[PDB]
Every structure is written in C-alpha cells, then in structure tokens.
C-alpha cells in the first residue's frame, strides 16, 4: 500500500502539505520530492496580493518544519517515469527509484491563442518569477490591460489600481468570476472595480494585437503597456498522460487520491476529483483544496482506516476593500441574502440552499459568519429560513447546536 | 497483473467479447460471470430493430463458444464488492473471489421526472424483457409517444410505423440525434420520419401525465395509449462508487481498463474513457465499444506488451429504409457532401474534416464507403478534397494506398 521510498513530483503547496502529513502520521521511510521552480517552496495566494504590493518573498514561503528528512531536489524537472519499473526520470540525468509516487504538479495558465505573435509584453500570473516580472511593469499611469474576469484578475486589477495604474479588464461572459461564484456576489464586485476606475468590457473577446494596441471581437481597440492574460489554467498532467495513467485536462483521482496506475497517486490542481456537493468530478482550484488533499491523501496511506478525502470546497480573494470567502456551490434553488449589499462600508453574506438544505455561502468582509456557516453547510443544515434572513440571529449559536 | 480467478460483473457484449478474448489469447484460469438477467446472454440493437418485428430471442443469443470454460451465474445480482478482501457479495448469498474484477455492468435508461406518477403505460426500451413488453402493445392503429429523438427512438418509431402504429415523438433538441451524429444527417433523418407519418415535435418537453394524456411545456396535449421514453442511459456504476472508486456517470477507466482500485477493470457502456479524436473523456454507448474495449482489455490483461485499447468510435443505426452508419466525430470545420440528399432512394456520403484531416464519416445506404472511409479517418488522412467530392474517385483505392 504506502510502499516505500515515496517520491513526489511538484513543490509546492499539495506537495509540502502531503509529505508533511506523511511525517506526523508517522512515516519514516525516504521521502524525496522534485520540484522544477529553482524556489523555497512557496505559497501562491501573496503573488496577486501583498507580494505584488510590497516584494518580500521571504515572507510566503511555505513551512516544511513538519516535514524533516526530506530531500528537495529544487530546480530539476521530472521528465517522465515508467510505472513498471518504478522509476522516475530527471532533468539532471539522475533517476530515482519509488514505492510510491505522488504526482503534485499543478496547473498552468492557459495562453490566449489570438496574442501569440504579440509584439507588446503578454504576461501571465503564476510564479513568483511571473510576479516579479509583472511588478516591474506596474509603472504608475501606466496601462495595463487584464484578459479574464477570475478571481487573480481582479486581484492583480486592485493591486494595480492601488499602485496607480490604469485598468481595463475584458472578460468574454457577462459577468465577474463566472466559476463558482453566486451571480450577487459577481455583480456587486463589477460594482465595486467599476467605482475604483477599472474599466470593464463584458462579452468581448480579443481578436489580436498590433503595435501595442489589443484588438477586440466588437471591432474596436484598447491601448495597453502591458497584458495579463487570466483565463484559466491548464492541469500539468503530461508525465501521467505519457505513463498511460486516465487524465482529461486533469488527472483522475478518487478520495484515497489513487489515480488508474497502480502505486501512483496525484493531489491538488494537477487532479479531477469528485465534488461532493454536486457529486460531479471538477478540477478544483483552490489552496484550500492543496492542503486538505494532501493532508487526507497522506493520512490514509499511513493509516488505511482513516477515511478518504470528504472536505467541502471553499475559497477566499482579495479584492481591495473586498475580503470575499466563498463556500460550497455558487447557486441551488433560493438565496438567503444577510444584511445590505452597498458600496458604502461593504458587509454581507449570502446563502445558497437546495430544497432548504444549505449547499453554499459567501462572506463579504465578515470573517466571523464563515466558519459557521461552512460548519452547516457541512452537515447540510436545514435551518429557519427567516432566521438565517433575521439580522439578528447569531449564526455561531446555529453551528454548534 | 492478470491474477486468477477472474470474476466479471455484467454478461452482456462487453463481458462475453472481454471472456471470449481472454480464453483465446491464452488465459486458462477460472473465469466466472454473473449475469443480473435470467438470459442466455443475447445482443441489444435487434430489439429496436428485427426482433420488435419478428419476436425470435434464439436469432439474437450471443456467441458462448470462444468462451470455453465459464460459469455463467445467470439470475444472479453481485450486491458489492470488497477489494481489500477481493471478494463479490452475491444476492443468492454467495461469496465470489478474485484475483482480477471486471466491471461490465453497462447502463439502464434514465427516468423521466415528469412522468414519475404516471396512470398510463410507461416503458422504457434496454433489455429482452422490455422489448417484450413493448412489442406486447404495438397494436395496430394504437398511438404511441416517444420521448426522445436518439437512434434507439426513431429505430422504434419506424418499426412501430411499419406495425401500423401511430407515432407522436417528443425531442427537446431541435433536432434529432443530437449527441454525436452531424446535423446535416439529424435534418434528413427528420424529414425521412415526418414522410413515414411520425409526428415530431421539437424545442419541447414532458411536463406531466394526466388519464391517458401527456402534458407538455408549450401548453399542449398528446393523447397516447404508451409511452416510451428514451432519453438516455445512465452508468450502472454503484458498486463501483460504494467501494471507492472514481466515477461520474461511469467507471473511469485507462486505455487498458483500469479503475482507480487495484486489481479491478471496466469495460463497456459501464465506463468513461478516453475518444481518441476529442481527446476527452466521454461515455461511450456503441456496440463497437462493448466489444472492442472488452477485446483490448482482456488482450493486454494476457499480454502486457499488447497496446492499450485505440480503437476509433463509431455506431450504426436501422431507421426503416435507412441504414446509417457514422463514424468518428460528428463534425470539424468543414463537410463534404458525395452523392445527392434526397427521399427519393436515399444514398449519400457525409465526410467531415479538421484542417483538411478527416475526422469522421456518415454513410446512408452506402455500406461499401464506410469501411474505407473508418481506415482513413484511423490514420487521419488528408485527402485532395475535390476527390473526396468527385462522385469518381473511388474510396477503397484511396485507403489501400
Ligand atoms: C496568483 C495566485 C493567487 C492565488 N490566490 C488564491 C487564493 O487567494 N485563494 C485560493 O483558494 N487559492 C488561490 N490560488 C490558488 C492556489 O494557490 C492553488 O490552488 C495551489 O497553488 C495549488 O497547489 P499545487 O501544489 O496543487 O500546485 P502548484 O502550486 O502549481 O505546485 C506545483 C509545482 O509542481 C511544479 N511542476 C510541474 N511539473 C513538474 C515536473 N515535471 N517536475 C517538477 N516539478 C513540476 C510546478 O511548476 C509547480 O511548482 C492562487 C493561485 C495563484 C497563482
Ligand atoms: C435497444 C437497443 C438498441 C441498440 N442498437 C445499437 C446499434 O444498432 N448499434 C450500436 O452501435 N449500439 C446499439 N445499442 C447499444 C449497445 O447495445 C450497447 O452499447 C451494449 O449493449 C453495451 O454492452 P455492455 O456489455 O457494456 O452493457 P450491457 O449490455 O448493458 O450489459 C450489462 C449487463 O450487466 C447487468 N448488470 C448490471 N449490474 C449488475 C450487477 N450488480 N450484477 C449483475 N449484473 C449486472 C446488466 O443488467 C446487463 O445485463 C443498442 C442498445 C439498445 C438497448
């Protein structure tokens, strides 16, 4: 089962989560991971919030405290691995030998195929080098043009925007973080970036690109120093498509994280996995699902009574003024919406229910109705409807009775 | 790898053809079956075609003899399974186990909601028994309405037409086929119907069902003496998903079968895998596949070296006077037409492309093109497209060279 030495592929948040928990789980054997960034391991979410604003990296690296004895074979890549032999091949020329293999090697951004002769600087947001990369461009009163209207746009936009630069965002649906995020929230964060001087553009597409100018699908142009392109990403999944293993933009995986080959698991944005709520398998996106994947991947290769991965997806931005934190799914049958949606001192939350059974929620500069709410949205709570309206009922009192 | 004893869940095309390929390929350990059904395992499409109309279940038996050396528990249901003990709880209170599990447990027809209280007969068309029934009520000058517009409805609408039964059908598509057949095809097949009498309705739905008549969503009635819904098919993967494996609506398997469990395989209808021409994952709900997934499979359990399954989809359809067989994807960015679409003696040739490679063919009443045209889609040609136009060139000459 958890057959030693374990090798993991990819360094970063799934991978040091996993070898973590593999070490407090009690796990002696060898653990090596190989991790193609020349980096300290490293957290994501600062790249597009105070990283991007203040430029220490020495404050997001990743903690592998928790995870003694392990050797970091930073700035090699794994070329393939042959799941027969049991062996992975190396960037380096080395080959290393495993029991188990786990295949934590995220996702990449997807290209935007109507810039790639672009002769103006397109940029994408991933690493800690992208970042740097961006940050160096954010001139004050320079232009910068965003492609895609996801949660690491917008955030590059208010980080942007409070840097003094000019934005424009163009986005193809009609509305904000289309993925997982309720319709009310969506069009309250347009509002928001609206206010702030980003200039929107819904339903349009960019057709291309001539002498630092981007062309539009509506026939008309927007002049830019610089492009961001979030579309989405794109799951790193090659070596395992290679291997033989089942992958669709994503490799398959079940709750023990098994993927189709036997001895090779995967974790984290690398993996298609089953989304309890919907009971359809989605790639998730999310640091959240990074670490609490890893750690119940890990868990139950060290323990095989412990149950598989059960955890309710969740995510949080940064937006400027904006603390969002979304749980669960973005709609069901009724929205419960608690307080007052306004631009003025924003402070709300919404509720998602199916048949009066909480499936969803979001926070809005309200930290403290989350966890509760994320605690009845995991036993599916079905609670007064007027209470969860009524302003004044503690949502805390709920959870814990 | 392949360990004995072998158990295969499902005695359907995919078991029998998966058994069959074992026993020829060398394998001489135990094999058993268990088959829910009480049948001498038989074929599904004449029941929509020669059966409905003749009713003689010995033409239509499967062909045992290749499989040498099996129990077949026919009658009998497998309740779960246990992959850590690799055992097969039986309904007859029996315990099966295995060294190797294959799943081909197939898919059974989804449910109309709306019709779920129905005081009126309401049948669906999958198994001998259901056939048997159906055909039971084909009295002539009766009404019959099909919910549904794909291959297994229209096959019952001609028949039923040709029995002299009155046919009403309901597609909620506005077209036919709309699931992996070009449009060019769904709009003649239309046509082809509308002139034998069937009266299609598009762009509507079953609302409900009130003494003898079918409400639908445009305010309207249909009054029918049956129903017979046929909208689809879902996995039969429960005990698949009880015992941990990755599924959605189906199994997910690899190019040599395998689920995410250790030591269990899938084959059939029961799996999502891999189109080699999307290059997405998909169900596929072909004979071609039942048979030619179980063949590769039980090939490469037997042979390591043999290469996982490849083989490219395609189906075949008997609508009255029209025999249609389609292949590959249903379309690209451009289609040749070769031949004339007409009523009158219907006879063409639909070929479709992606940047000047094939990617898929339809042929009506052509059986002679298909199988040249199935070689080069195989290999992905790029034919002069002039010829694959020019009722001269001769298909057959272009695959062989
Ligand atoms: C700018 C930004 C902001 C974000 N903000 C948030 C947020 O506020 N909240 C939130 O919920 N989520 C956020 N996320 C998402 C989050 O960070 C991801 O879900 C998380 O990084 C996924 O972790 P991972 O370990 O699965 O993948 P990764 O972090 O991508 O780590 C995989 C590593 O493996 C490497 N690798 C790939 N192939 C190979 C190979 N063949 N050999 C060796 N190494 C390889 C990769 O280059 C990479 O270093 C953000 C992400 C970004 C980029
Ligand atoms: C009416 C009809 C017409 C068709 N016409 C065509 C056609 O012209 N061309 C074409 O390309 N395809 C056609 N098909 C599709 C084709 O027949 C299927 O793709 C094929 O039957 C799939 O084979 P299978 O072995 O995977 O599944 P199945 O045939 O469904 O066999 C699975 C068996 O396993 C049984 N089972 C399920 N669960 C259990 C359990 N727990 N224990 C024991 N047994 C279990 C099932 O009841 C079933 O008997 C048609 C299908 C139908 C129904």
């Known amino acids: 089962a958890l057959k030693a030495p374990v090798v993991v592929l990819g360094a970063g948040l799934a991978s040091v989560s996993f070898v973590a928990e593999l070490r407090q789980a009690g ?136 840097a003094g630069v000019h934005v424009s965002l163009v986005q193809t649906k009609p509305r904000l973080m289309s993925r997982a995020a309720p319709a009310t929230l969506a069009d309250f964060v347009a509002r928001y970036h609206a206010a702030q001087g980003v200039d929107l553009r819904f339903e349009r597409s960019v057709t291309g690109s001539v002498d630092g100018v981007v062309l539009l699908d509506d026939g008309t142009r927007i002049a830019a120093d610089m492009v961001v392109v979030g579309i989405g990403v794109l799951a790193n999944d090659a070596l395992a498509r290679a291997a033989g293993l089942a992958c669709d933009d994503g490799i398959f995986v079940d709750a023990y994280g098994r993927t189709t080959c036997p001895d090779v698991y995967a974790l984290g944005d690398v993996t298609r996995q089953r989304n309890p709520l919907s009971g359809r398998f989605e790639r998730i996106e999310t640091w959240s699902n990074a670490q609490n994947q890893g750690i119940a991947v890990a868990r139950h290769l060290v323990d095989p009574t412990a149950p598989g991965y059960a955890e309710l997806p969740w995510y949080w931005s940064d937006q400027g003024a904006l603390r969002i934190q979304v749980a669960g799914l973005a709609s069901g049958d009724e929205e419960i919406v608690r307080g007052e949606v306004s631009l003025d001192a924003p402070k709300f939350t919404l509720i998602e229910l199916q048949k009066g059974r909480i499936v969803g929620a979001t926070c809005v500069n309200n930290a403290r109705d989350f966890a509760p709410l994320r605690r009845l949205l995991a036993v599916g709570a079905k609670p007064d409807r007027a209470a969860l309206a009524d302003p004044a009922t503690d949502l805390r009192k709920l959870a814990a009775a």
Chains 1, 2 share one sequence.
């Open 27 to 162: 796990y002696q054997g060898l653990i090596t991971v190989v991790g193609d960034e020349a980096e300290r391991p490293y957290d994501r979410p600062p790249l597009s919030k105070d990283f991007m604003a203040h430029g220490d990296a020495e404050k997001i690296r990743l903690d592998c405290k928790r995870a003694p004895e392990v050797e970091w074979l930073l700035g090699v890549t794994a070329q393939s691995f042959d799941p027969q032999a049991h062996t992975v091949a190396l960037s380096d020329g080395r080959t290393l030998p495993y029991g188990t293999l786990v295949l934590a090697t995220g996702a990449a951004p997807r290209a935007l195929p109507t810039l790639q002769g672009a002769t103006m600087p397109v940029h994408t947001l991933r690493t800690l080098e992208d970042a740097r990369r961006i940050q160096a461009g954010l001139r004050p009163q320079s232009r910068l043009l965003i492609v895609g209207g996801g949660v690491i746009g917008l955030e590059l936009a208010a980080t942007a925007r409070t």
